[PDB]
Amino acid sequence: VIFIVAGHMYRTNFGIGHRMQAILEAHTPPSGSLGAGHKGLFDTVNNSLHFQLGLALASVGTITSLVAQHMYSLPP
Amino acid sequence: RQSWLPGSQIPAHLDTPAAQALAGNFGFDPLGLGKDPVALRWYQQAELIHCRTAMAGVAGILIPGLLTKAGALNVPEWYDAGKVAIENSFAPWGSLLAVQLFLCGFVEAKRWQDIRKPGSQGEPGSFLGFEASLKGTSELGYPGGPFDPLGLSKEADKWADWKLKEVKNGRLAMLAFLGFVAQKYATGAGPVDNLAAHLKDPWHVNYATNGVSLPFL
Amino acid sequence: LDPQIVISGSTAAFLAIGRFVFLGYQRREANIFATNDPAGFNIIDVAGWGALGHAVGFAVLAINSLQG
Amino acid sequence: TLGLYVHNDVMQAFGTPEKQILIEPVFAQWIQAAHGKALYGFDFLLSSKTSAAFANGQSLWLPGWLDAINNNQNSL
Amino acid sequence: DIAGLTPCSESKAYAKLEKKELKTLEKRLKQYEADSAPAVALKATMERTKARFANYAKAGLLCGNDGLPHLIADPGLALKYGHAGEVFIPTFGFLYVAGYIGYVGRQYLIAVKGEAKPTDKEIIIDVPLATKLAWQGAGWPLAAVQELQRGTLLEKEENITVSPR
Amino acid sequence: GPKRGSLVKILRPESYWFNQVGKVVSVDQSGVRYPVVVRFENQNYAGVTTNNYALDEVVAA
Amino acid sequence: KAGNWLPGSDAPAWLPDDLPGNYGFDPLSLGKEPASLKRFTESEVIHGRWAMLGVAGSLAVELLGYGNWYDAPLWAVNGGKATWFGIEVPFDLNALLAFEFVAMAAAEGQRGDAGGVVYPGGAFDPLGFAKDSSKSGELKLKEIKNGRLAMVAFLGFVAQHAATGKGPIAALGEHLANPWGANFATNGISVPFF
Amino acid sequence: KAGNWLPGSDAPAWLPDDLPGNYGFDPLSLGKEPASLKRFTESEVIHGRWAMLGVAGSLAVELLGYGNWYDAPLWAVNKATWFGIEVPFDLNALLAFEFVAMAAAEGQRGDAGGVVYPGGAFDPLGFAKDSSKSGELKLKEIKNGRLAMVAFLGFVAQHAATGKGPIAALGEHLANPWGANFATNGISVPFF
Ligand code: CLA
Ligand code: CLA
Ligand code: CLA
Ligand code: CLA
Ligand code: CLA
Ligand code: CLA
Ligand SMILES: CC1=C[C@H](O)CC(C)(C)[C@H]1/C=C/C(C)=C/C=C/C(C)=C/C=C/C=C(C)/C=C/C=C(C)/C=C/C1=C(C)C[C@H](O)CC1(C)C
Ligand SMILES: CC1=C[C@H](O)CC(C)(C)[C@H]1/C=C/C(C)=C/C=C/C(C)=C/C=C/C=C(C)/C=C/C=C(C)/C=C/C1=C(C)C[C@H](O)CC1(C)C
Ligand SMILES: CC1=C[C@H](O)CC(C)(C)[C@H]1/C=C/C(C)=C/C=C/C(C)=C/C=C/C=C(C)/C=C/C=C(C)/C=C/C1=C(C)C[C@H](O)CC1(C)C
Ligand SMILES: CC1=C(/C=C/C(C)=C/C=C/C(C)=C/C=C/C=C(C)/C=C/C=C(C)/C=C/C2=C(C)CCCC2(C)C)C(C)(C)CCC1
C-alpha cells in the first residue's frame, strides 16, 4: 500500500504530480551555505549514466548489507 | 625596576607603558601567557577576581578558625562547615546552588559585558536608576559608584598604593587557599592546627615528615 | 459499525476540502483537459482527492475495528 | 585499535590477563536496553515496565519481541 | 553495577585468577633453594602480584564473568558511579601532553621559518630555541585559545590547492 | 609589468606554485607570451624553482 | 526599538527598529535574510496567539476544577465521554478529528491564501481597537510580549509535567507550600547531580 | 537646602536647593544624572508614604490590642478579623481584589509622566493652593516618611532579633534599659 501510494507522486501526462527539476530548484537554503543548492543537478543525474549507476550501486550495496544483517538475526 | 628574579631579563610585553602601570608588575611571565595585550587585559581581570574572592574565602577560613581557638564562635572546620551548615539550614544544597548560580550569573554577566565594552552598562533605560552608577572608573576592573561606598578611591595620591596592597594581599591569599587544600589532604587537620604543630616542634613537624609531599625520603 | 457513513463522509470531506480551500494553492504549485466545472476541478482532481478520502476512511475504519 | 590489541597480547604473553585494557561497550548495550534486553540493568523505554512505549506496544507486538530478545539461544 | 558487572572485590573469578597466578608462581618457586637469587626474584614477583590485585580491588574496578577489570567510557556514567579515573582523567591527561607536543612543534616551525635557512634548522636542531619553546609550552591551552580567538591560528585561503579547488 | 625583486602571487591554477608567493627575476619587453620570470624558494616535483608566467597570472601581493 | 535583551551590546542591522518586539535579540543570526525574517515574524505572531490560547485553556481547566491539561484528552483512551464546563459533549474521537481537520483546514487555507497578512483587521477586528493607525504599534508590542510570555509558560507546563508529573496550579501550590524544598533542583530530573 | 547630613562636607553639585529634603546626602553619587534623580524622588516619596501608612497600621494593631503586624496574616496559614469583627474572605479572593485594585490605581498613577504631587481630588482641603507653605509641608512630608521608613526597618530587624512586637519591646526597654536592648539580645552583637 505504501509503495502504490508513493508511485502516484510524479507528474506524468495527467496534470497532477511533482516535477523533479522544480523540487531540485526549490531546495536551496538561505545564507548560501550550500551555494546554489541543488540547482542544475537534474541535468547531471538524467544525462549521466555513471551517476545513476553509482547511486544504484550505493543503494543496492547498503541494502545487501541490510539483507545479511537482518537475515542472520531475524531468520525468516 | 623590581623583579621576581634580580638578574633575569624582563619579558618585552611586561615592559611596556601599558603593562608597567598595571598593579604589582614584577616581570613574572616565564610561560609568556601575556604576550597578547587582549589576553593580558583578560588575565588582569581574572587575577583581580581570583584575588578578591580568594581573600574573602581565606578570611572566612582564618578568622572563624582563629576565633574558634579563642572563647567564642564554635565553628567547624572549613572542610566540614558545609555539612554542618546544610544540617542547620532550611534548603537542600542543590536548590541553594541553583539560586546562587542565577544570582551570580546575573552579576558575572554584567561584569562580562563591561569587560567586552568599557562604556557598556551606562545605557539609559537599561536600568531603573542604577544604570548611571554601573559604569567604570576609567580603569577596567576598578568600578565605582555603589561599589566602594567609603570613597577611598577618590584620592589620587594613595591610589597606586591601594592597588598594590590589593594585589599583594590577593596573591598571598591565593597561596593561602592552595595551602589550605594541600595541607588538608596531607595532614587531615585544620590550618590553625597545622600552625600550632609547626610552632610546637618546627624541626620535626613539617612537609618533609608528613610522608606524602616527597615520598622518596 | 457503519462503513458507508464513514467512507462517504471522509470522501465528501476530502473532496470538499480540495474543491474549495486547496484548489488555488494546487494550481499555483502546478504552474481530462477540460470540464465545465467553474473552477477547473476536473476528473483527475476528483480521483486524487477521492483516493485520499477512501484511504483516510478505511484507516479510520481499521483503527476503529481494532478498538484502539 | 592496534595498540589495544598489541597491549592485550603482551598482557596475555606475560601471564597477567588482569592488566589488559577491556573497555565495556556501554553505548551499544544502552541501545540493547532501549530495545528491551534485561541483562544490563539500564531499564528504560522498553526494558522498564513503567514506560510509555512499553505500555503502548504491550497488547500487540511486544510480547513476542521481548521473549525473542531475552533469549540467549538465538542471534537476536 | 553498570551493565551487570560485579565489582572486582566481590567477584569470585577475580580471586580464582589471583590464586591461579600465585599457584603457578609457587610451582615455579618450589624447585630452588631458600635464600637464592631465583627464589628472591620469584618472591618479589609474588609480592608485586598480590600488591597489584589488592590495588585493582581497592580502586573499585568492575569485573565481568571472567574476573577481569572492565573500563567505563561515558563521562556522566563514570562520574556518577565513581569510575572517572580510568578513561576521563586519562583522556584529559593525554590531551594535555599531546597538545603540549603539537604546540611546541608548531612554535618551533614558526620560529624557524623567519630565517635565511628554515630547512637547515629543520635538519640541524636549534637546541637552545627548542628548549626555550619546550619550557614555554606549559601554557599551551591558554595560548591556543588566544590564537584561536585572534584569527592567527589559521592560515587564510593562500593555501595550495588543485585547479578544481 | 612588475619590477625586479618584487613579490608576486600566481593565479595559474595548474601550476605548482598557484596561490603562493615568489620573486620576480625579470620581465621581457618583447612580444613574448610569458615574460614574467619568477623564482620560488621551494621546488616542484620536477626539482625546478623557476617558471615563466603571463601578466594576468601574477599579482604583486 | 522595544529595549535591549543584553544592555551594552549592539543591535543587529538586519532587525528594523519599527518592527514590534525588536529587542535586538538574535545571537544565532537566524533572521538575517529578509524573506526568512518575514516568515519568522508571521510564525512568531501565530505561535504566540496559539500559546496564549493554550495557557489560558490550561489555567481555565485546572482552576475551575476539571483536571489539568494532561488529563483532558484521557476520555478518548479509556471508556468515557467528553465534557465542557461539566456539560457532557456527545461526540467520539473520530468525529471530533473530522470536525477539527475540516474546520482547521478551511481556516488555515484561507489564512494561507493571503500573502503576508499578519494583522488582518476587518471581520477579525469587530470592536475596532486597531482603527487608529497611531496607537496600533503599542498594542502590537503588547501582543508580542504577552505571546512570548505565553510560549515560555506553555513550554514550562510541558517540562514541569515531564519532570514532576503534576498540574501547573498544583506545582504553584507546592512551590508556595515549601519554596526551598520544592523546585526544579529538588527534583532528581532537571539537574542529575543535585 | 534642608541642612547638612555631615557638617564640613560639601553639597553635591547635582542636587538643587529647590527640592525637599536636600541635606546633600549622596555618597554613592546615585542621582547624579537627572532622569535617575527624578525617578528616585518619585520612589522616595512613594516609599515614604507607604511606610507612614504601614508604621501607623502596625502601631494601631498593637496599641488597640489585636496582636502585632506579625500575628496579623497568621489566620490564612491556619479566619480574618478587623476591629475584632470578622471579615468573610480567604487569601485567594483577597489577593484577587488587591491585585485588581492595585493594578488599576498603580496604572492610573503610572500613566502620568512625572507627577509626584497630584493635588486635585487627592487634595480635597486645598493646603497646597498657596505655593509658599507648600514646600515646607513637602519637607515635613519627606522627613516624616524617612523617619517612618527607618521605623519600619527597625520593626523588622527588632522582631527578627527578639520575636516580639515594637510596643512590647519598647515596654521591655522602659522596664530594664540596661538588660533589654540590642545587645542583651545576643544577635546584633554576636560575641559575649
Ligand atoms: C601561604 C603561605 C603558607 C604558609 C605560611 C604555610 C605554613 C605551613 N605549611 Mg603550608 N602549604 C602552602 C602554603 C603555606 N603554608 C602551599 C602553597 C602548599 C602547597 C605546595 C602547602 C602545602 C603544605 C603541606 C603538604 C604541609 C604544609 C605544612 C605547613 C606548616 C609547616 C611549615 C612547612 O613545612 O610549610 C611548607 C611550605 C611550603 C609548601 C612552601 C610555602 C609556599 C610559600 C608561597 C613560599 C613563600 C613563603 C614566603 C616567602 C614567606 C612565608 C610567608 C608568611 C610569613 C605568611 C606551616 C604552618 C606542613 C604541616 O601541615 O605541618 C603541620 C605540611 O605537611 N604546607
Ligand atoms: C559519544 C557519545 C555518547 C553516548 C552515546 C553517550 C551515552 C549516554 N550518556 Mg553520555 N556523555 C557524553 C557522550 C556520550 N554519552 C559526553 C561527550 C558528555 C559530556 C557532555 C556526556 C555526559 C553525560 C552525562 C552527565 C550523563 C550522560 C548519560 C548517558 C547515558 C544516557 C543518556 C541519554 O539517555 O540521552 C540520550 C543520549 C545522547 C543524547 C547522547 C549524548 C549524551 C549527552 C551528552 C548527555 C545526555 C544525558 C541525559 C540527558 C541524562 C539522562 C539522565 C538519566 C538518569 C536518564 C547514555 C549511556 C547519563 C547517564 O549517566 O545515564 C545513566 C547522564 O546523566 N552522559
Ligand atoms: C518559535 C516561535 C518563535 C519565532 C518564529 C520567533 C521569531 C522571531 N523572534 Mg522571537 N521569541 C520567542 C519565539 C519565537 N520567535 C520566544 C518564546 C521568546 C521569549 C524567550 C522570544 C523572544 C524574542 C526577543 C527578545 C526577540 C525575538 C525576536 C524574533 C525575530 C528575530 C529572531 C529570529 O530570527 O529567530 C527565529 C526564531 C526561531 C527560528 C525559533 C525556533 C528556534 C530553534 C529552531 C529551536 C529552539 C528550541 C528551544 C531553545 C528549546 C528549549 C528547550 C528547553 C527545555 C530549554 C523573529 C521574528 C527579535 C525581534 O526583533 O522580535 C520581533 C527580538 O528582539 N524573540
Ligand atoms: C513562564 C515562566 C515560568 C514560571 C512563573 C514558572 C514557575 C514554576 N516552575 Mg517552571 N518552567 C518554565 C517557566 C516558568 N516556571 C520553563 C520555561 C521551563 C523549561 C525550562 C520550566 C520547567 C520547570 C521544571 C522542570 C519545574 C518547574 C517548576 C516551577 C515551580 C517552582 C519554581 C522553579 O523552580 O521553576 C524553574 C525555573 C526556571 C525554569 C527558570 C525560570 C526563568 C524564566 C523561564 C524566565 C522568565 C522569568 C521572568 C524573568 C520572571 C518571572 C515572571 C513571572 C513571575 C510572571 C514554579 C511554579 C518546578 C515544580 O514543579 O515545582 C514544584 C519544577 O520541577 N518549571
Ligand atoms: C526607600 C528608598 C529611597 C529612595 C529611592 C531615596 C532617594 C533619595 N534620597 Mg532618601 N532616604 C531614605 C530612602 C530613600 N531615598 C531613607 C529611609 C532615609 C533615612 C535614612 C533617607 C535619607 C536621605 C537624606 C538625608 C537625603 C536623601 C536624599 C535622596 C535623593 C538623592 C540620593 C540618591 O540619589 O540616591 C538614590 C537612593 C537609592 C537608590 C535608595 C535605594 C536603596 C539602596 C540601593 C540600598 C540601601 C539599603 C539600606 C542602606 C539598608 C539599611 C540596613 C541597615 C541595617 C543599615 C534621592 C531622591 C537626598 C535628598 O536630596 O533628598 C531628596 C538627601 O539629602 N535621603
Ligand atoms: C527609628 C528609630 C528607632 C527607635 C526609637 C528604636 C527603639 C528601640 N529599638 Mg530599634 N531599630 C531601629 C530603629 C529604632 N529603634 C533600626 C533602624 C534598626 C535596624 C538597625 C533597629 C533594630 C533593633 C534591634 C535588633 C533591637 C532594637 C531594639 C530597640 C529598643 C531598645 C533600645 C535599643 O537598643 O535600640 C536599638 C539601637 C539602634 C538601632 C542603634 C541606634 C541607631 C538609631 C537607629 C539612630 C537613630 C536614632 C535617633 C538618633 C534617636 C531616636 C529617634 C527617635 C526618638 C525618633 C528601643 C525601643 C531592641 C529591643 O527589641 O529591645 C527589647 C533590639 O533588640 N532595634
Ligand atoms: C602568574 C603565572 C604566570 C606565568 O606565565 C606562569 C605561571 C607561573 C604558571 C602563572 C602562575 C599561576 C599561579 C601560581 C596560579 C595560582 C592560582 C591560585 C592558587 C588561585 C587560587 C584561588 C583561590 C580561590 C579563588 C579560593 C577562594 C576560596 C573560597 C571562596 C573559599 C570558600 C569557602 C569558605 C569560606 C569556607 C567554607 O567552609 C567552604 C568554602 C566554600 C571552601
Ligand atoms: C528567538 C530566537 C532567536 C535566536 O537567534 C535563536 C534562538 C534563541 C534559538 C531563538 C529562540 C527560540 C525560542 C526560545 C523558541 C521557543 C518557542 C516556544 C516556546 C514555542 C511554543 C509554542 C507553543 C504553542 C504554540 C502552544 C500552543 C498550545 C496549545 C494549542 C495547547 C492546547 C491544549 C490545551 C489548551 C489544553 C488541552 O487540555 C490540551 C492541549 C491540546 C495541549
Ligand atoms: C539615600 C541613599 C543615597 C546614597 O547615595 C546611598 C545610600 C546610602 C545607599 C542611600 C540610602 C538608602 C537607604 C537608607 C534606604 C533605606 C530604605 C528603607 C528603610 C526603606 C523602607 C521602606 C519601607 C516601607 C515602604 C514599608 C512599608 C510597610 C508597609 C506598607 C507595612 C504593611 C503591613 C502592615 C500595615 C501590617 C500588616 O500586619 C502587615 C504588613 C503588610 C507588613
Ligand atoms: C457533479 C456535481 C456535483 C456532485 C459531485 C459528486 C457527488 C462527486 C463525487 C465524486 C466521488 C464520489 C468521487 C470518488 C472518488 C473515489 C476514488 C477515486 C477512490 C479511490 C479509492 C482508492 C484509491 C482506494 C484504495 C485502497 C484499496 C483499493 C484497498 C484498501 C487500501 C486503499 C483504501 C488505499 C455537485 C452536487 C457537488 C454540484 C453539481 C455538480
Q: At what angle do helices H134-162 and H34-63 cross, to 10 degrees?
A: 60
Question: In chain C, where are the structural domains located?
Answer: 1-68
Whether the CB-CB separation of H146 and H47 falls below 8 Å is answered with: no
| Cα E69 to Cα B152, E53, E59, distances in angstroms | 63, 10, 11
How many angstroms separate the CA atoms of G51 and G9, rounded? 30
Whether the CB-CB separation of G175 and G183 falls below 8 Å is answered with: yes
How many angstroms separate the CA atoms of E44 and E49, rounded? 9
How many angstroms separate the CA atoms of B68 and H191, rounded? 12
- Provide the CB-side half-sphere exposure for E151 (13 A, CA): 2
The reply to whether B212 touches chain G by the CB within 8 Å rule is: no
- Provide the CB-side half-sphere exposure for H119 (13 A, CA): 8
Residue G69 CB partners (closer than 8 Å, separation 6+): G54, G57, G58, G61, G62, G157, G167
Residue G79, all three cell numbers: 471508556
Residue G155, all three cell numbers: 513550554
Phi-psi bin for A17: left (phi > 0), alpha (psi -120 to 50), beta?
A: left
Residue G35 CB partners (closer than 8 Å, separation 6+): A30
End-to-end Cα spacing for chain F: 13
| Angle, CA H132 vertex, CA H130 and CA H137 arms, to 5° | 95
Phi-psi bin for E160: left (phi > 0), alpha (psi -120 to 50), beta?
A: beta
The reply to whether D75 touches chain A by the CB within 8 Å rule is: yes
Question: In chain E, where are the structural domains located?
Answer: 1-165
- Nearest chain H CA: its distance from B148 CA (Å): 8
Whether the CB-CB separation of D6 and E55 falls below 8 Å is answered with: no
Grid cell 519591646 in the structure block, residue: H169
Whether the CB-CB separation of G32 and G14 falls below 8 Å is answered with: yes
- Backbone discontinuities in chain C, residue before each (C to N > 2.5 A): 31
How many angstroms separate the CA atoms of B131 and G60, rounded? 40
Q: Which residues of E touch F49 (CB under 8 A)?
A: none
Grid cell 620560529 in the structure block, residue: E111
How many angstroms separate the CA atoms of D47 and D32, rounded? 9
CB–CB of H28 and B145 under 8 A?
yes
Nearest residue (by CA) to ligand 3, atom 48, is G155
How many angstroms separate the CA atoms of D38 and D45, rounded? 12
- Nearest chain E CA: its distance from F32 CA (Å): 25
**E83-97 residues labelled b (16+ CB within 10 A) or e (exposed):** beebbbeeeeeeeee
Residue of chain G nearest C14, judged by CA positions? G102
Q: Which of E77, E79, E81, E87 to mutate to test the pocket of ligand 2 (most atoms within 8 A of CB)?
A: E77
**G96-127 residues labelled b (16+ CB within 10 A) or e (exposed):** eebeeebeebeeebeeeeeeeeeeeeeeeeee
The reply to whether B151 touches chain H by the CB within 8 Å rule is: yes
- Ligand nearest the Cα of residue D32 is 2
How many angstroms separate the CA atoms of E108 and E132, rounded? 10
Residue E15, all three cell numbers: 580471586
How many angstroms separate the CA atoms of G104 and H192, rounded? 76
Residue A3, all three cell numbers: 509503495
Using alpha carbons, select from B192, B190, B187, B178 the residue that is nearest to residue B57.
Answer: B178
Whether the CB-CB separation of H122 and H25 falls below 8 Å is answered with: no
CB–CB of E163 and F14 under 8 A?
yes
How many angstroms separate the CA atoms of A21 and A36, rounded? 14
Query: C54 C-alpha vs ligand 10 centroid, how far in Å?
Result: 7
Grid cell 631579563 in the structure block, residue: B9
- Nearest chain G CA: its distance from A16 CA (Å): 19
Q: At what angle do helices C3-19 and G93-113 cross, to 10 degrees?
A: 10
Tally of CB atoms within 10 A around H81: 12
DSSP string, chain H: ----SSTTPPPPTTS-SSSTT-----SS-TT-SHHHHHHHHHHHHHHHHHHHHHHHHHHHHHHTTS--TTTTTHHHH--EEETTEEE---HHHHHHHHHHHHHHHHHHHHHSSS-S---TTS-SS-TTSSSSSHHHHHHHHHHHHHHHHHHHHHHHHHHHHHSS-HHHHHHHHHH-TTTSSTTTSSSSS---
Q: Which of G176, G184, G189 to mutate to test the pocket of ligand 4 (most atoms within 8 A of CB)?
A: G184
Using alpha carbons, select from H76, H103, H105 the residue that is nearest to residue H92.
Answer: H76
CB–CB of E158 and F14 under 8 A?
no
How many angstroms separate the CA atoms of H182 and H173, rounded? 10
Beta bridge partners of F7: F23
Whether the CB-CB separation of F8 and F18 falls below 8 Å is answered with: no
Whether the CB-CB separation of B170 and B45 falls below 8 Å is answered with: no
Q: Which residues of C touch A11 (CB under 8 A)?
A: 30
Beta bridge partners of F53: F36
Residue B54, all three cell numbers: 580568594
| Angle, CA E153 vertex, CA E152 and CA E158 arms, to 5° | 75
The reply to whether A32 touches chain G by the CB within 8 Å rule is: no
Q: Which of E135, E138, E150 sits opposite B36 (nearest CB)?
A: E150
Percent helix, strand, coil in chain G, to 5, is 50, 5, 45
Q: What is the dihedral of CA F24, F26, F27, F28, to 10 degrees?
A: -160
- Nearest chain A CA: its distance from D4 CA (Å): 27
**Ligand 5 in reach of H145 Cβ (< 6 A):** no
**Ligand 5 in reach of H43 Cβ (< 6 A):** yes
Q: Which residues of E touch G192 (CB under 8 A)?
A: 76, 80
Query: F32 C-alpha vs ligand 1 centroid, how far in Å?
Result: 80
Grid cell 612537609 in the structure block, residue: B207
Strands F50-53 and F36-39 come out as antiparallel
Task: Return the ligand 8 atom nearest residue G48 CA.
Answer: 25
For the stretch G119-124, contacts whose Cβ atoms lie closer than 8 Å and that sit 24 or more positions apart, written own/partner, are: G119/G45
Whether the CB-CB separation of F54 and F34 falls below 8 Å is answered with: yes
Domain count for chain B, please give it: 1
Q: Domain span at residue F40? A: 1-61
The reply to whether A30 touches chain G by the CB within 8 Å rule is: yes
Whether the CB-CB separation of D22 and E71 falls below 8 Å is answered with: yes
Q: At what angle do helices E88-112 and E127-136 cross, to 10 degrees?
A: 140
| Residue H141 annotated as lining a ligand binding site | yes
How many angstroms separate the CA atoms of H46 and H105, rounded? 13
- Nearest chain E CA: its distance from F49 CA (Å): 16
Using alpha carbons, select from G153, G165, G164, G167 the residue that is nearest to residue G54.
Answer: G153
Residue G161 CB partners (closer than 8 Å, separation 6+): G68, G70, G167, G168
Q: Which of B94, B96, B121 sits opposite G7 (nearest CB)?
A: B121
CB–CB of H191 and B72 under 8 A?
yes
The reply to whether G184 touches chain B by the CB within 8 Å rule is: yes
Q: What is the resolution of this structure in A?
A: 2.9
Q: At what angle do helices G34-64 and G136-163 cross, to 10 degrees?
A: 60
Tally of CB atoms within 10 A around G62: 20
Find the largest Cα–Cα distance for chain A.
49
Beta bridge partners of G128: none
How many angstroms separate the CA atoms of C12 and C54, rounded? 10
May I ask the CATH architecture of the domain E1-165? Answer: Orthogonal Bundle (1.10)
How many angstroms separate the CA atoms of B22 and E163, rounded? 53
Strands H80-82 and H85-87 come out as antiparallel
**Ligand 1 in reach of B213 Cβ (< 6 A):** yes
Whether the CB-CB separation of G163 and G190 falls below 8 Å is answered with: yes
Whether the CB-CB separation of D54 and D48 falls below 8 Å is answered with: yes
Task: Return the ligand 8 atom nearest residue G70 CA.
Answer: 38
Distance of CA H92 to the CA centre of its chain: 26
| Residue B123 annotated as lining a ligand binding site | no
Residue F42 CB partners (closer than 8 Å, separation 6+): F17, F49
Q: Is C53 exposed, middle or buried (0-12, 13-18, 19+ CB in 10 A)?
A: buried
Distance of CA E93 to the CA centre of its chain: 7
**B2-12 residues labelled b (16+ CB within 10 A) or e (exposed):** eeeeeeeebbe
Overall size of chain G counted in residues: 194
Instruction: Give the type of residue at C54.
Output: H
Tally of CB atoms within 10 A around G194: 17
Using alpha carbons, select from F53, F46, F44, F43 the residue that is nearest to residue F8.
Answer: F53
Q: Which of G94, G102, G112 sits opposite C64 (nearest CB)?
A: G94
Phi, psi of C48 (to 5 degrees): -70, -45
Pocket of ligand 6 (CB under 6 A): H 150-151, 153-154, 157-158, 161-162, 169-170, 172-173, 180-182, 185, 188
Query: G51 C-alpha vs ligand 8 centroid, how far in Å?
Result: 6
Q: Please give the DSSP secondary-structure letter assigned to residue G182.
A: S
Q: Which residues of G touch B91 (CB under 8 A)?
A: 180-181
The reply to whether A2 touches chain D by the CB within 8 Å rule is: no
Question: Does some domain include residue B142?
Answer: yes
**Ligand 3 in reach of G66 Cβ (< 6 A):** no
Alpha-helix runs per DSSP H in A1-76: 2-6, 20-26, 42-45, 49-73
The helix (H) or strand (E) run that includes residue D55 is helix D52-56
Beta bridge partners of F21: F9
Using alpha carbons, select from B131, B152, B157, B130 the residue that is nearest to residue B142.
Answer: B152
Strands E62-63 and F21-27 come out as unpaired
CA-derived radius of gyration, chain A: 17
Beta bridge partners of E160: none
Q: Domain span at residue B102? A: 12-200
| Angle, CA E120 vertex, CA E117 and CA E124 arms, to 5° | 140
CB–CB of C13 and G113 under 8 A?
no
How many angstroms separate the CA atoms of B156 and B164, rounded? 14
Grid cell 601599558 in the structure block, residue: B18
- Nearest chain B CA: its distance from H42 CA (Å): 11
Residue of chain E nearest D31, judged by CA positions? E3
For the stretch H79-85, contacts whose Cβ atoms lie closer than 8 Å and that sit 24 or more positions apart, written own/partner, are: none
CB–CB of H39 and B129 under 8 A?
yes
How many angstroms separate the CA atoms of G179 and G175, rounded? 5
Domain count for chain F, please give it: 1
Whether the CB-CB separation of H55 and H152 falls below 8 Å is answered with: yes
Phi, psi of E158 (to 5 degrees): -105, 20
Q: Which residues of G touch A31 (CB under 8 A)?
A: 32-33
Q: Which residues of E touch F13 (CB under 8 A)?
A: 162-163
Q: Which residues of G touch B129 (CB under 8 A)?
A: none
Q: Which of G25, G52, G161, G187 to mutate to test the pocket of ligand 3 (most atoms within 8 A of CB)?
A: G25
Q: Which of G94, G98, G105 sits opposite C21 (nearest CB)?
A: G105
Find the largest Cα–Cα distance for chain E.
78
CA-derived radius of gyration, chain B: 22
Task: Return the ligand 8 atom nearest residue G68 CA.
Answer: 38
How many angstroms separate the CA atoms of C57 and C51, rounded? 10
Query: G8 C-alpha vs ligand 4 centroid, how far in Å?
Result: 27
Instruction: Give the type of residue at G17.
Output: D
Using alpha carbons, select from B194, B212, B177 the residue that is nearest to residue B69.
Answer: B194
Residue H181 CB partners (closer than 8 Å, separation 6+): H173
How many angstroms separate the CA atoms of B129 and H39, rounded? 7
Whether the CB-CB separation of F12 and F53 falls below 8 Å is answered with: yes
Alpha-helix runs per DSSP H in chain C: 3-19, 23-29, 43-66
Whether the CB-CB separation of B23 and B140 falls below 8 Å is answered with: no
Q: Which residues of E touch F14 (CB under 8 A)?
A: 163
Using alpha carbons, select from B134, B137, B139, B105 the residue that is nearest to residue B122.
Answer: B134
CATH of the domain at F27: 2.30.30.50
Alpha-helix runs per DSSP H in G16-167: 34-64, 93-113, 136-163
Strands F21-27 and F7-10 come out as antiparallel
Find the largest Cα–Cα distance for chain G.
59
How many angstroms separate the CA atoms of A46 and A66, rounded? 27
**Ligand 9 in reach of H45 Cβ (< 6 A):** no
Alpha-helix runs per DSSP H in chain B: 17-20, 37-67, 81-88, 93-116, 159-186, 191-200
